[PDB]
Design an enzyme around this catalytic site. Structure first.
Site, mmCIF file in Angstrom:
data_model
loop_
_atom_site.group_PDB
_atom_site.id
_atom_site.type_symbol
_atom_site.label_atom_id
_atom_site.label_comp_id
_atom_site.label_asym_id
_atom_site.label_seq_id
_atom_site.Cartn_x
_atom_site.Cartn_y
_atom_site.Cartn_z
ATOM 1 N N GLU A 229 4.255 0.649 -2.144
ATOM 2 C CA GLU A 229 5.460 0.651 -2.191
ATOM 3 C C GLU A 229 6.215 -0.494 -1.854
ATOM 4 O O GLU A 229 5.598 -1.120 -0.848
ATOM 5 C CB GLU A 229 5.851 1.916 -1.901
ATOM 6 C CG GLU A 229 7.419 2.069 -1.413
ATOM 7 C CD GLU A 229 7.403 2.573 0.158
ATOM 8 O OE1 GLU A 229 6.605 3.382 0.370
ATOM 9 O OE2 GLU A 229 8.544 2.139 0.757
ATOM 10 N N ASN B 185 0.125 8.003 18.548
ATOM 11 C CA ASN B 185 1.432 7.972 18.202
ATOM 12 C C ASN B 185 2.134 8.857 19.539
ATOM 13 O O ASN B 185 3.398 8.620 19.876
ATOM 14 C CB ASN B 185 2.187 8.158 16.980
ATOM 15 C CG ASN B 185 2.406 6.942 16.197
ATOM 16 O OD1 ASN B 185 2.412 5.797 16.855
ATOM 17 N ND2 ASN B 185 2.698 7.070 15.079
ATOM 18 N N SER C 121 -2.276 2.796 9.368
ATOM 19 C CA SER C 121 -2.305 4.275 9.897
ATOM 20 C C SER C 121 -3.475 4.933 9.307
ATOM 21 O O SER C 121 -3.897 4.736 8.270
ATOM 22 C CB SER C 121 -0.925 4.743 9.452
ATOM 23 O OG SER C 121 -0.845 5.055 8.165
ATOM 24 N N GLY D 123 -0.082 -0.511 4.358
ATOM 25 C CA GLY D 123 0.511 0.505 4.564
ATOM 26 C C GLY D 123 1.885 0.271 5.018
ATOM 27 O O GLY D 123 2.289 -0.961 5.677
ATOM 28 N N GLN D 124 2.826 1.437 5.286
ATOM 29 C CA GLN D 124 3.857 1.282 6.280
ATOM 30 C C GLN D 124 3.833 1.046 7.551
ATOM 31 O O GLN D 124 4.351 0.011 8.192
ATOM 32 C CB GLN D 124 4.730 2.618 6.046
ATOM 33 C CG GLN D 124 6.028 2.622 7.032
ATOM 34 C CD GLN D 124 7.003 3.574 6.856
ATOM 35 O OE1 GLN D 124 7.899 3.425 5.735
ATOM 36 N NE2 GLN D 124 7.091 4.705 7.549
ATOM 37 N N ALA D 125 2.797 1.755 8.227
ATOM 38 C CA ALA D 125 2.554 1.661 9.625
ATOM 39 C C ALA D 125 1.785 0.078 9.960
ATOM 40 O O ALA D 125 2.466 -0.426 10.964
ATOM 41 C CB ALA D 125 1.759 2.556 10.403
ATOM 42 N N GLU E 95 -17.147 -11.496 20.540
ATOM 43 C CA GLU E 95 -17.392 -11.002 21.801
ATOM 44 C C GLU E 95 -16.837 -9.707 22.210
ATOM 45 O O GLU E 95 -17.173 -9.059 23.223
ATOM 46 C CB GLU E 95 -16.283 -12.190 22.697
ATOM 47 C CG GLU E 95 -17.297 -13.590 23.144
ATOM 48 C CD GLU E 95 -16.619 -14.293 24.405
ATOM 49 O OE1 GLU E 95 -16.052 -15.193 24.406
ATOM 50 O OE2 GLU E 95 -16.502 -13.590 25.485
ATOM 51 N N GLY F 183 -1.539 7.735 2.887
ATOM 52 C CA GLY F 183 -2.353 7.548 1.840
ATOM 53 C C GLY F 183 -2.734 6.048 1.543
ATOM 54 O O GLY F 183 -4.039 5.990 1.142
ATOM 55 N N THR G 1 4.737 12.549 9.279
ATOM 56 C CA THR G 1 5.277 12.463 8.137
ATOM 57 C C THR G 1 4.689 13.602 6.820
ATOM 58 O O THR G 1 5.061 13.778 5.761
ATOM 59 C CB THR G 1 5.537 11.217 7.230
ATOM 60 O OG1 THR G 1 4.375 10.578 6.574
ATOM 61 C CG2 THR G 1 5.916 10.075 8.297
#
Ligand SMILES: C=C1C[C@H](C)C[C@@H]2CC=C[C@@H](C/C=C\C(=O)O[C@H]([C@@H](O)/C=C/[C@@H]3CC(C)=CCO3)C[C@@H]3O[C@H]3[C@@H](O)C1)O2
Ligand SMILES: C/C(=C\c1csc(C)n1)[C@@H]1C[C@@H]2O[C@@H]2CCC[C@H](C)[C@H](O)[C@@H](C)C(=O)C(C)(C)[C@@H](O)CC(=O)O1
Ligand SMILES: Nc1nc2c(ncn2[C@@H]2O[C@H](COP(=O)(O)OP(=O)(O)OP(=O)(O)O)[C@@H](O)[C@H]2O)c(=O)[nH]1
Ligand SMILES: Nc1ncnc2c1ncn2[C@@H]1O[C@H](COP(=O)(O)OP(=O)(O)CP(=O)(O)O)[C@@H](O)[C@H]1O
Ligand SMILES: Nc1nc2c(ncn2[C@@H]2O[C@H](COP(=O)(O)OP(=O)(O)O)[C@@H](O)[C@H]2O)c(=O)[nH]1
Ligand SMILES: [Ca+2]
Ligand SMILES: [Ca+2]
Ligand SMILES: [Mg+2]
Ligand SMILES: [Mg+2]
Ligand SMILES: [Mg+2]
Ligand SMILES: [Mg+2]
Lengths: 351, 428, 52, 437
Positions: D71, D206, D140, D10-12, D254, D144, D179
């Site tokens: 994407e 965040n 994230s 994903g983006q994050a 560990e 999605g 978002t």
């Protein structure tokens, strides 16, 4: 325009605080489950502290200190005094107390018996009192000089109890030969300043103190609820069994050649300071994402040598009817408006 | 490159659609020739969302123009940017629709609909990854209303998993062409409830009043009304047109804006709106944008938001200003008027900022709200509808094209059900 | 306080200080396919309704 | 030496992944073309840094990383970025259209189509490994893809690699930078589906990173770039023991052993100090005692909560820079008298300490000042349940009206999964409470 919510409808003090906030014309009450509030007058139990301080653009303030229950529950208070170096087992203003779990459930049974036997053999006064946090007003209490009846009373119940040495030589108001207890209102703000309310109240018994009968609990228990019911002299000496400070002070001067400030209040201020400073690291909101304040009700006992004793601390205390107006306004002035400003002779003593 | 395919239908749809392409073309630095002339690369980054690159090196609007008579479209071709559109994307009949939903939907429109779909398909195939469609039209006439909803039905059948989006102009007696507008609007609203993902409700009543009251124009024209629409359309499509984190495509916008499938009718707003002429020179403070933007006076659906509650709100700010100030003012509005935002959808207000401002302005704000107060619009139209329908007035125009009374009865039930649904969530 | 398990090297040091004392592939495939079938059935209903 | 494979989803996940590998390269002296001069074993090695980088006969040092996103715009930045030469195409996987902040779209609709390709690309990296240790998964909660595709990946990784360990770095949803309205749904859906399959997960809210950036870096309104560079430092301090010579947290096993006695409660809290603005003209250099004490200040935590009102199951201190054990032991004793720190009855009150002599590396032209010593504390405290409580409550408000649910059902998910996932969280909230008492 500051916003706030109300989550304790049965709070005498804060309903008055609520009404006051509206009269400012700069505070707007919101539905109780709306989270965009500046101020929360929260519930007594299971207040969602974890949900405070995560609303961007809102400075949030609640009227309770998370953690303060350590001081305000009977068992916890005893534990806190015994295990805190700065209070310590050798503490001189708190009655010898022991934590006792009923047998159908750590515990200090054998430690209590150990000191009880030492007192019996030493001819010392050996009356004790059992109580707990589940003590719905006047019930849940047994005063006795026999350990057997005490421990047997606790086992019949289901929650944790405390056994506390009963002070057998209280100071007695004249005329009447009668017991009393002192209630102090203490407001701790978001900066951890400790403010003692100028006015206190003596909650007095109207029945002469009788050391030969710990069965009839009317001259022994100062709880207003008990006096307004079982006592037939309720309201004889003072209205509603409430003596205030001007009168009590005048009396001490007339009868004992001392003032309320010198004989008693110094000790009260010392105790309030000691208790609250002890838990300060545990509960301070100095660098927290939300801020707390809280009003406490400290209960004191005076003995015949003019020595003050701590009985219990209340986390959600009511006021005395004639003092509601003043104290509630003070809460607003120093607890709330300090954080949220509106557009000389303080009623508090800063400890 | 997530492409959007644009369709404008009928007189109102084509006039408003032509203005929209004028405004956004300017913003993207594309001239009537289709040749680019811009200072900033930001302009070209997501140009492909709305424009095709047919040949070196012009950009062609992915736009299809549709009408049942040729007049308005001929006028579009004459207009300043007329040459920009693809000549093959003009699809018109000769008969007209006579402000009649049934002619657009069932008779005249049916004859021309496949022709439109051929062009739609032609555009869609040339999409690397197609997002969905947007349609501009009115609900008051016949072509945009009746044939517009027919197209949407056919498009959904052919592309059942694309987003369908519309800008729909609602009729009002204040700016009225004919008495059958409530009939046409009521029939159309039902189609939209079933078959669109997002509908921006542009109220001609609101557009007029904003012109009359705020802009101090004693006699507003369709030109004045359309300038409001093109400004708003530019603002609501900013997130699709420019680089950004939020509401960056149609589906994501729908997911944020629409909690229940039937309730997808949005009230747009714009700021600033300033009467001439002394005041126009001063730039507006971020607080000012915010306060005007949430003002009922700035609303273009002619419903009072204070009469209902917001399910969701999307704001957009352009261009050069402080995000810190933008965040602070936005948070101020919600915090001070929190009763107006349902508590069962936490954080229902999202905000975007884009650097490039609209032409002629240092900064601006566009508001898109899913309010339950939108029910006032459908109510107003439901009233007008049944007043005539009780006496079956003007029905012969419709029965004459093959419709019967039942379909009218069904349409009115469905819009009354729609109003009830809104009321439900205003109380919840 | 007690220190234990001290281990040194050129990069650094480490130690302890004590103050006091599943779905199978088939199952996953079945779930993904079940979701796909449900999606197919909703779309078929849509087209059916559209055909009407 | 045992290898670790990093997966960014994903983006994050991808953007954070980008920040970490940049930092890893700076720390290990690896150039953007991937040449590492100081590495005298050309074309191969089994040094500690090799757990994260493989080598080509040509001398290139290549991250053992897979980037996945539905994407292509974010991964295209990698493909075309300052460190493009490092990675190769089989490492980067994109799709045509994204999950639209819809868990079910990422898990069911779009995940089904791309999961086999992702496993194959991961398989290619694992085949390169003599002794694969497991995976670090960056994603994230709110997106999605981040929520939906990650949960599917986790289920299938448990299957293809049952023995291996899986660690998580999860971005917890925050409205200041959020978002989407439906992030709470996605968070709970993904947490329910991923609970069995994760051994240890590091949550980063965040909200906390944002405030630290505002408060200590003096950034008026932080971007994702500010956020990620700070996050990558925490990630680096957590993974340093895997990439450097040492004796603590030497392998993925560990982490579970030292931080997670109770398998379901596998979310340790991270606290980091000190964060100092580069723009500050001069700053006094904090002592071991000061940074260690700062580990107990809520303002320095990755997730805001109050550890004073919970219980510790495990505590771990990882120092970087000029630190010696005696200073650490001294500092702990002082903290122990002042601060409030309760452990569970069934665990020892104690700290495992790790020290790395190399001070934290910082990105040139970043917002973070170079400092002589720093520490990251990993503590398994029940207080982190506060974060779940907030999430669950928001979930509850929306779900009661069934707001937004049709988007999920529309992708093929059943309504029952919502309640099923929420039930799991209710159980998790109870588990913390029982331990926390
Ligand atoms: C300046 C104010 C009131 C306060 C000081 C501003 C406060 C802070 C920021 C924004 C505004 C809200 C924005 C516009 C507004 O209130 O306009 C009103 C009218 O349009 C009613 C708007 C309400 C506001 C909201 C938020 C929901 C429902 O609609 C119209 C108000 O008369 C206009 C002006 O007085 C608004 O609230
Ligand atoms: C320039 C405008 C506002 C403004 C700029 S600076 C300031 C203090 N206010 C807006 C522009 C918005 O795009 C919308 C244009 C709407 C045009 C009008 C309907 C009309 O056609 C126009 C001729 C006018 O009425 C004005 C010239 C008075 C117009 O500037 C009013 C306005 O606010 O436009
Ligand atoms: N800290 C940080 N958070 C991010 C970043 N990018 C997105 N987020 C957060 O992640 C959530 C959004 O999820 P994304 O990762 O962007 O979405 P995704 O996983 O790509 O899923 P889809 O867009 O639905 O395909 C929001 O809460 C964002 O604040 C980032 O670069 N850094
Ligand atoms: N050790 C002791 N010696 C003498 N009298 C005592 C005593 N402990 C309690 N009492 C008397 O018994 C009464 C009982 O009050 P106690 O503090 O035990 O319960 P409480 O009714 O105040 C509960 P809370 O304040 O939380 O509502 C006191 O008012 C006091 O007069
Ligand atoms: N805002 C706006 N409304 C219009 C315009 N032209 C027509 N209308 C409105 O649209 C409705 C008439 O339908 P119209 O689109 O002209 O008929 P059609 O060609 O059959 O689709 C009426 O409500 C008119 O008020 C326009 O340019 N702008
Ligand atoms: Ca014909
Ligand atoms: Ca090597
Ligand atoms: Mg009392
Ligand atoms: Mg016409
Ligand atoms: Mg017309
Ligand atoms: Mg994405």
């Amino acid at each position: 325009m500051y916003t706030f919510v109300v989550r304790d409808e049965n709070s005498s003090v804060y309903a008055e605080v609520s009404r006051l906030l509206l009269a400012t014309g700069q505070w707007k009450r919101l539905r109780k489950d709306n989270p965009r509030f500046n101020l929360m007058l929260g519930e007594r139990n299971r207040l969602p502290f974890g949900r405070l301080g995560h609303e961007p653009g809102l400075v949030q303030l609640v009227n309770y200190y998370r953690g303060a229950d350590k001081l305000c529950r009977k068992a916890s208070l005893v534990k806190l005094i015994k295990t805190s170096p700065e209070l310590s087992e050798s503490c001189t203003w708190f009655p010898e107390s022991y934590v006792i779990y009923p047998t159908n459930l750590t515990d200090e049974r054998e430690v209590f018996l150990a000191a009880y036997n030492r007192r019996r053999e030493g001819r010392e006064g050996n009356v004790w009192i059992a109580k707990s946090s589940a003590g719905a007003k006047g019930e849940g209490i047994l005063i006795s000089s026999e350990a057997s009846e005490l421990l047997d009373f606790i086992d019949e119940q289901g929650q944790v109890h405390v056994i506390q040495k009963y002070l057998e030589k209280p100071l007695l108001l004249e005329p009447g030969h009668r017991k009393f207890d002192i209630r102090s209102w203490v407001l701790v703000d978001h900066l951890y300043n400790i403010y003692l309310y100028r006015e206190g109240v003596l909650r007095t018994s109207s029945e002469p103190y009788n050391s030969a009968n710990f069965q009839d609990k009317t001259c022994h228990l100062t709880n207003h609820c008990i006096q307004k019911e079982y006592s037939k002299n309720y309201g004889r000496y003072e209205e509603g069994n409430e003596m205030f400070f001007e009168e009590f002070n005048q009396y001490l001067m007339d009868a004992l050649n001392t003032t309320l400030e010198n004989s008693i209040l110094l000790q009260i201020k010392h105790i309030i300071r000691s208790c609250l400073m002890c838990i300060e690291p545990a509960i301070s909101t100095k660098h927290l994402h939300y801020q707390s304040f809280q009003l406490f009700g400290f209960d004191f006992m005076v003995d015949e040598e003019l020595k003050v004793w701590l009985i219990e601390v209340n986390g959600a205390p009511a006021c005395a009817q004639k003092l509601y107006a003043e104290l509630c306004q003070g809460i607003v002035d120093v607890a709330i408006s300090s954080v949220f400003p509106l557009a000389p002779t303080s009623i508090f003593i800063k400890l | 490159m997530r492409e959007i395919v644009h369709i404008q239908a009928g007189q109102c749809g084509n006039q408003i659609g032509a203005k929209f392409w004028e405004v956004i073309s300017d913003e993207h630095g594309i001239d009537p020739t289709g040749s680019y002339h811009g200072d900033s690369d930001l302009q070209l980054e997501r140009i492909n969302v709305y424009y095709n690159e047919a040949t070196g090196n012009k950009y062609v609007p992915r736009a299809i123009l549709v009408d049942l008579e040729p007049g308005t479209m001929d006028s579009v071709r004459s207009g300043p940017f007329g040459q920009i559109f693809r000549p093959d994307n003009f699809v018109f009949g000769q008969s007209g629709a006579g402000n009649n939903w049934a002619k657009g939907h069932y008779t005249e429109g049916a004859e021309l609909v496949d022709s439109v779909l051929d062009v739609v398909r032609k555009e869609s195939e040339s999409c690397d990854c197609l997002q969905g469609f947007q349609l501009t039209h009115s609900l008051g006439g016949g072509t945009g209303s009746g044939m517009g909803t027919l197209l949407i039905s056919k498009i959904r059948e052919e592309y059942p998993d694309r987003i369908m989006n519309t800008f729909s102009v609602m009729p009002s007696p204040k700016v009225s062409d004919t008495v059958v507008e409530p009939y046409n609007a009521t029939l159309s609203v039902h189609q939209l409830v079933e078959n669109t993902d997002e509908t921006y409700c542009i109220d001609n009543e609101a557009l007029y009043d904003i012109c009359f009251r705020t802009l101090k124009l004693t006699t507003p024209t369709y030109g004045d009304l359309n300038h409001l629409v093109s400004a708003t359309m530019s603002g609501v499509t900013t997130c699709l047109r420019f680089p950004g984190q939020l509401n960056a495509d149609l589906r994501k916008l729908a997911v944020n804006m629409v909690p229940f499938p039937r309730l997808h009718f949005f009230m747009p707003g714009f700021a600033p709106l300033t009467s001439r002429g002394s005041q126009q020179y001063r730039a507006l403070t971020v607080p000012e944008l915010t306060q005007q933007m949430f003002d009922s006076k700035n609303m273009m659906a002619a419903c009072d938001p204070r009469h209902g509650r917001y399910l969701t709100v999307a704001a957009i700010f352009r261009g050069r200003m402080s995000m810190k100030e933008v965040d602070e003012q936005m948070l101020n509005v919600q915090n001070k008027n929190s009763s107006y935002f349902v508590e069962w959808i936490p954080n229902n207000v999202k905000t975007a900022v884009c650097d490039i401002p609209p032409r002629g302005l240092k900064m601006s704000a566009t508001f898109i709200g899913n309010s339950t107060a939108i029910q006032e619009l459908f109510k107003r139209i439901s009233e007008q509808f049944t007043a005539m329908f009780r006496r079956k007035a003007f029905l012969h125009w419709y029965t004459g094209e093959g419709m019967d009374e039942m379909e009218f009865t069904e349409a009115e039930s469905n819009m009354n059900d729609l109003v009830s649904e809104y009321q439900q969530y205003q109380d919840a | 306080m007690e220190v234990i398990e001290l281990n040194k090297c050129t990069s650094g040091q480490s130690f302890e200080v004590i103050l006091k004392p599943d779905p199978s592939l088939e199952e996953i495939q079945k779930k993904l396919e079940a979701a796909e079938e449900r999606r197919k059935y909703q779309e078929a209903e849509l087209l059916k309704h559209l055909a009407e | 030496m045992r290898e670790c494979i990093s997966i960014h989803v994903g983006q994050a996940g991808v953007q954070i992944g980008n920040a970490c590998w940049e930092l890893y390269c700076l720390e290990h002296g690896i150039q953007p073309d991937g040449q590492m001069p100081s590495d005298k074993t050309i074309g191969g090695g089994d040094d500690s840094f090799n757990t994260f980088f493989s080598e080509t006969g040509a001398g290139k040092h290549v991250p053992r990383a897979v980037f996945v996103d539905l994407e292509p715009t974010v991964i295209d930045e990698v493909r075309t970025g300052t460190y493009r030469q490092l990675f190769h195409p089989e490492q980067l996987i994109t799709g045509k259209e994204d999950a639209a902040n819809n868990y079910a779209r990422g898990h069911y609709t779009i995940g089904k189509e791309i999961i086999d390709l992702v496993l194959d690309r991961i398989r290619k990296l694992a085949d390169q490994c003599t002794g694969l240790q497991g995976f670090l998964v960056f994603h994230s909660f709110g997106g999605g893809t981040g929520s939906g595709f990650t949960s599917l990946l986790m289920e299938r990784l448990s299957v293809d690699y049952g023995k291996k360990s899986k660690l998580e770095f999860s971005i917890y949803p925050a409205p200041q930078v959020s978002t989407a309205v439906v992030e709470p749904y996605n968070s709970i859906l993904t947490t329910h589906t991923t609970l069995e399959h994760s051994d240890c997960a590091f949550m980063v809210d965040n909200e906390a990173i944002y405030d630290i950036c505002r408060r200590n870096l003096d950034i008026e309104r932080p971007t994702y770039t500010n956020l990620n560079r700070l996050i990558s430092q925490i990630v680096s301090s957590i993974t340093a023991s895997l990439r450097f010579d040492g004796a603590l947290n030497v392998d993925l096993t560990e982490f579970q052993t030292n931080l997670v006695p109770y398998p379901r409660i596998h979310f340790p809290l991270a606290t980091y100090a000190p964060v100092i603005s580069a723009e500050k003209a001069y700053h006094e250099q904090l002592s071991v005692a000061e940074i260690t004490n700062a580990c107990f200040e809520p303002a320095n935590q990755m997730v805001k909560c109050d550890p004073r009102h919970g219980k510790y199951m495990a505590c771990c201190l990882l120092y970087r820079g000029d630190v010696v054990p005696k200073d650490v032991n001294a500092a702990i004793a002082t903290i122990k008298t002042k601060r409030s720190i309760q452990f569970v009855d069934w665990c020892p009150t104690g700290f495992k300490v790790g020290i790395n002599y190399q001070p934290p590396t910082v990105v040139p032209g970043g917002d973070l000042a170079k400092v002589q010593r720093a520490v990251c504390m990993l503590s398994n405290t029940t207080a982190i349940a506060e974060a779940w409580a907030r999430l669950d409550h928001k979930f509850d408000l929306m779900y009661a009206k069934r707001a937004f649910v049709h988007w999920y059902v529309g992708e093929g998910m059943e309504e029952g999964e919502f309640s099923e996932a929420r039930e799991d969280m209710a159980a998790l909230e109870k588990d913390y409470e029982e331990v926390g008492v």
